[PDB]
Design a protein around this nucleic acid. Structure first.
Lengths: 138, 337, 151
RNA sequence: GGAGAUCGUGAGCUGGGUUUAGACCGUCGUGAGACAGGUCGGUUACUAUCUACUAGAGGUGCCCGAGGUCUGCGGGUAAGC
RNA sequence: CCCUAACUGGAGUCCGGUGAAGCUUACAUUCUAGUGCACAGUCUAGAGACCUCUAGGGGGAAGUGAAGACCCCGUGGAGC
RNA sequence: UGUUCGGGUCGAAGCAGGGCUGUGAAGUCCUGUGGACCGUUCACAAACGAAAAUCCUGGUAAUAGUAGCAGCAAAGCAGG
RNA sequence: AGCUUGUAGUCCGUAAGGGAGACAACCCAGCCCGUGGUUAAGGUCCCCAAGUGUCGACUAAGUGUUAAUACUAAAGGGCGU
RNA sequence: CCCGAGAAGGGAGGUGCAAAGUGCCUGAAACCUGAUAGUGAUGGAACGAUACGGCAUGAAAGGAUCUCUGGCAUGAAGGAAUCAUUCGCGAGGAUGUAGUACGAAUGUCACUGCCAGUGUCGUAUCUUACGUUUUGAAGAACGGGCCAGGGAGUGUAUCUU
């Protein structure tokens, strides 16, 4: 159970993906809305609305909207998810907005190298902000 | 090439245009509570159309104050039974049903739809819901209701139709109290809607089966010399060379009608109790005569005769308090003439 | 032209065999009927075939589905192969008679083997446009049926 | 308003033009004949195997067995201009 | 034609009987981009995709029909 | 084909499948089937080795239980 | 001009295997079979084997994350740093 | 003899060393029907090669110091770990431990009853068919639906070697 609050999105995703590929545990990620994406808010919002409205969304790419599902997608992009190994890895991963009631009070962990206070500037936005500006209710 | 532009044939706002998964319309949104507690929806059965002569009371209209002939839809609306109270909990993943209490005594013909819930836990179920509301696990409350079409004669069916309706109240406790008051009772359409008010009508439209793109989307026919070269009622092109596929936006044949549709701002012109006031000589064609209480809806409504029509309080109404219509003449002449 | 060996040989003591010899029927329809009726008791297979011939019961077409609509009830594509059902019922009558001759009890026996085999084709012709004659053949089918009194 | 999509679109249509065989006028050439000159006339093949889409079904998966009522991950919209 | 509607008979659709032919190296549920003989369902990286069946018009398969009749070449022909 | 040495109704050739050897062309053996012919040494010959020729002849698929069995022309019904 | 025509070397043509996303000719390398080890090119956050490696700075533009290649936009300007 | 409308056909029963049952010796493949083994309605495609696993088979023709699992001896290239000292701003390096323990393999002693092979499926890496025309072929360049059989440097004369 990893707490995604104040964590770099890509670095948390890389850590969790490599742990899942090491393949001895089920990983739960809570407060996915509280993950951090470094860079200017305008640029991050522009790229994320481009990815959301890009594809042949009738029969093309289907980029998610909820922050937890977006984080799941980000981890999916760092996995061999078309393979049996990556399919098992994604099946062993659950991501939550906030803390689910069953995991409430459980002991969490944090990735020290994914911490947002190692960033050198204030040019960042939260995944929850990205999702709610793309129109996700959570 | 300098092209002539046209608006696209039909609307892509109703795609996929498939058959509705049920014969009952389901409401996806409920309006704001703006007064005393009451049900936000009712359900009747469409009978047919007639017309009335009324004085134009519509403010600011050119014909205001003069005699105007207004087509009306007659909707036979027997009292519905409040069968159950359902509680909904809001979380990050949306609303979930958390509790349900069924009325102790329910109509025996409800077995045509479902095996009848027993007269088991109602007091303790209600106190459980009260505890849930007190502890904050309940986000809102809805009333499960069902119609009793056995009293009608133009509708052949005796199996009731069941549907959820919102409760309009300023607070969740008020909603729960009102639902407890109305639980297991028979609500009349006067206890939901008042005369002269605007409503939204949902219904399954007339089924036309499989229809071509000309009728289904309103595409042009082939014209002139092309009209008799073998593709008359038939789309000119399915797509360009690239992309190498037929878009879903190209008008094509498929199911037409039997869709769910919502019409907005249909005004109630009369809440009647005696169907002899509206039934014409010879009866309504293929329906018969009205016997119970009924409603007159200004204009047209989706669905054919005998279709279940769901009425709800307006969700996008513009005008304020409209008033009571002054119906000077209801036409009962033979519709078969 | 001649007699044919069977794909399966059941034991003579508890089994009866029969062969419809080169019937002028549809091999595809007969294959579907054989697939439907294989494994049934002889009496229930007879009742099913009677229902098919009376149009009260459709046989599912899972291998040769094209040209068949969907049927009412829990079924996909299905048809009413009248000629195939009549021929297979004649073969079933022969097999039941053979069982009775052996001394077995067809009321308690099961169709354990029901197969078709394409036989020799009688070659006809269909005159076509522009001086062309194309084939129109008489396909023949052998129906092998094996009932047994045990399973 | 302009432009792209095999100058989108002939297993959709048309055939007016260009691009066959006939013929006339003018100009070249002794001639046959010719002309990004003009003129009149001049056959538009196919039963869809796969894929894509539009709609309608039967299954299997999920699942105490069944039924009912809902939620909404998502998709679409010009929830009008 | 504006602008299409209804109806009639024959097909089609569904059922019984009869029963061909034409495309086919293989595999094949695809979509986007790039790459590649510079016009890819199969290569590369992504995105999708539960299977089967029925109907339907033809987007694509640079669909099928055919050793291009346009152009050039051949110390290949024919007629004039 | 000459020549040396053989095998076969106690089952030759061929055929389906398999074991072993050989880099391999291939050889040998086993099981079944089959019912009368077949190899081997050293040499010599050739109408001597096929995956391709829009190859030829024969057989047979997918297409497919599909198209067609609809302008002819009102086409049949009852009873026996 | 991924144009045309020369010249020297080397390649593809006729060149495996490893690496550059794929890449006829770009980098290592010319390659009998099997086993073990260590390296070349290239890479070491995950996909993907090995660094969330070290030191000193720059960049705030998602600029960039593109040896060569025709697969990478200029002149001019900036009290941006 | 029984079934069957039957001068069809089938069954049963015979003849014959053998049905070889009359277009009947042998009876391949394509194609079609059924059964068996594996897999299978969340899945990615030159249909395979290599390595490792699941399931099935493994009678003959293949192995019996052969298969499995260990011990001991010798072992080429290569070659640690841990710890001590020292250097470096640091990541780390050097020296010793140590050319040691190990190490392809070669022998030897126990243990074991399988292994090889075959079919199918799965995981990992690789590979865009074949022949041809081509500077360049997976090509949206040409050829083949499939299978069987047929199908292409030969003789005379003469010259040279």
């Amino acid at each position: 159970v990893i707490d995604a609050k104040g964590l770099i999105l890509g670095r948390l995703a890389s850590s969790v993906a490599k742990q899942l590929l090491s393949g001895d545990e089920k990983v739960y990620i809570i407060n996915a809305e509280q993950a951090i994406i470094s860079g200017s808010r305008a640029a991050t919002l522009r790229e994320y609305r481009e990815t959301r409205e890009r594809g042949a969304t009738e029969f093309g790419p289907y980029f998610p909207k909820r922050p937890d599902r977006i984080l799941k997608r980000t981890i999916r992009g760092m996995l061999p998810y078309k393979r049996a190994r990556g399919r098992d890895a994604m099946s062993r991963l659950k991501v939550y907005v906030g803390v689910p009631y069953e995991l409430k009070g459980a002991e969490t962990v944090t990735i020290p190298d994914a911490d947002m206070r190692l960033l050198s500037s204030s040019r960042y936005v939260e995944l929850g902000e990205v999702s709610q500006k793309m129109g996700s209710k959570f | 090439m300098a092209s002539i532009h046209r608006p696209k044939r039909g609307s892509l706002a109703f795609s996929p245009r498939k058959r509705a998964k049920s014969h009952i319309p389901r409401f996806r949104a409920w309006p704001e509570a703006t007064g005393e507690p009451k049900l936000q929806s009712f359900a009747g059965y469409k009978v047919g159309m007639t017309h009335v002569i009324m004085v134009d009371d519509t403010k600011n209209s050119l014909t205001q104050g003069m005699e105007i002939s207004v087509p009306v839809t007659v909707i036979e609306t027997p009292a519905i039974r409040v069968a159950a109270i359902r509680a909904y909990a809001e979380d990050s993943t949306g609303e979930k049903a958390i509790a349900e209490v069924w009325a102790a005594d329910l109509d025996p013909e409800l077995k045509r739809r479902i095996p009848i819930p027993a007269a088991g836990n109602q007091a303790e179920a209600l106190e459980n819901i009260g505890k849930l509301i007190e502890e904050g696990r309940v986000s809102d409350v809805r009333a499960v209701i069902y119609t009793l079409p056995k009293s009608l004669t133009g509708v052949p069916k005796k199996v009731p139709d069941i549907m959820e309706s919102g409760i309009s109240a300023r607070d969740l406790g008020t909603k729960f109290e009102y639902s407890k008051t109305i639980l297991g009772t028979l609500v009349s359409v006067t206890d939901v809607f008042k005369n002269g008010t605007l409503v939204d009508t949902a219904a399954i439209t007339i089924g036309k089966g499989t229809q071509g793109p000309v009728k289904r989307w309103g595409i042009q026919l082939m014209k002139g010399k092309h009209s008799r070269q073998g593709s008359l009622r038939q789309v000119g092109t399915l797509g360009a060379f690239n992309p190498s596929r037929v878009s879903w936006r190209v008008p094509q044949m498929g199911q037409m009608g039997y869709h769910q549709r919502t019409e907005f701002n249909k005004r109630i012109l009369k809440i009647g109790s005696d169907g002899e006031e509206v039934t014409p000589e010879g009866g309504f064609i293929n329906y018969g005569l009205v016997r119970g209480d009924y409603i007159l809806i200004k204009g047209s409504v989706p669905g054919p005769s005998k279709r279940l029509i769901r009425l709800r309080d307006p969700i996008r109404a513009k005008k304020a308090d409209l008033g009571e219509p002054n119906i000077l003449y209801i036409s009962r002449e033979s519709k078969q003439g | 032209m001649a007699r044919i060996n069977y794909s399966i040989n059941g034991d003579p003591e508890t089994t009866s065999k029969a062969m419809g010899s080169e019937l002028h029927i549809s091999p595809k329809k007969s294959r579907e009927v054989c697939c439907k009726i294989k494994g049934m008791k002889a009496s229930e297979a007879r009742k099913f075939l009677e229902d098919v011939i009376a149009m009260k019961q459709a046989v599912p077409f899972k291998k040769h589905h094209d040209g068949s609509g969907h049927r009412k009830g829990p079924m996909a594509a299905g048809k009413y192969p009248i000629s195939a059902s009549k021929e297979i019922l004649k073969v079933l009558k022969n097999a039941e008679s053979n069982a009775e001759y052996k001394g077995l009890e067809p009321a308690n026996m099961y169709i354990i083997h029901a197969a078709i085999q394409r036989g020799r084709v009688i070659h006809g012709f269909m005159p076509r446009a522009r001086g062309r004659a194309t084939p129109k053949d008489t396909e023949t089918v052998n129906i092998e049926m094996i009932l047994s009194e045990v399973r």
